[PDB]
DNA sequence: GGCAGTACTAGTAAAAGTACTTGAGCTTGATC
RNA sequence: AAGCGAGAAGAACCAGAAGACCAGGC
DNA sequence: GATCAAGCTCAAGTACTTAAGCCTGGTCTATACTAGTACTGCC
């Protein structure tokens, strides 16, 4: 076995069994301009 | 020594995941 | 260099469970 | 032009396969009813 992310043997198992529903599927969204710099637009 | 009675041997009796199939609802066309 | 009695072989001659369950080390 | 029937697609439900390695000891192993099978007293 801030936020919770699947890691270790479970995560490796999901990666190699190419599961459809990951236990903790997430998105690393990256901002472009001012939204990226300031926090109000973000 | 034969008949019937009886005990023994036998012989039969508090898993999880993925894939496939079926049913229902949509999509399209044909007919009156 | 030593040197003071004799020998030779008849017959024939290893063993399986397997299965289940439990405990235990790593 | 509208309705009905047929075909196609999607979602849900049910069934089938895998669960680390090797290594050491121990104990335990079908009733149950049955017909025949012989013995053995009883007469």
With vertex at residue A31, the alpha carbon angle to CA A27 and CA A36, rounded to the nearest 5 degrees, is 135
Question: From the CA of A21, how many Å to the C1' of D6?
Answer: 36
Question: From the CA of A9, how many Å to the C1' of D27?
Answer: 39
Residues present in chain A in total = 42
CB atoms within 10 A of CB A3: 5
Q: List chain B nucleotides near protein: any atom < 7 Å from a Cβ.
A: 17-18
Question: From CA A6, how far away is CA A30, in angstroms rounded?
Answer: 21
Helix ranges, A1-42 (H): 9-17, 34-37
Residue A27 has what DSSP assignment? -
Q: In a 3-state reduction of DSSP, which class is residue A17? A: helix
Question: From CA A34, how far away is CA A25, in angstroms rounded?
Answer: 27
CB neighbour class for A34 (10 Å; exposed up to 12, middle 13-18, buried from 19): exposed
**CB-contacts to strand B (7 A):** A 17, 19-20
């Amino acid at each position: 076995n801030a936020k919770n992310v699947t890691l270790g043997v479970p995560r490796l198992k999901e990666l190699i069994n190419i599961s459809k529903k990951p236990k903790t599927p997430s998105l690393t969204v990256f901002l472009l301009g001012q939204s990226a710099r300031d926090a109000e637009r973000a």
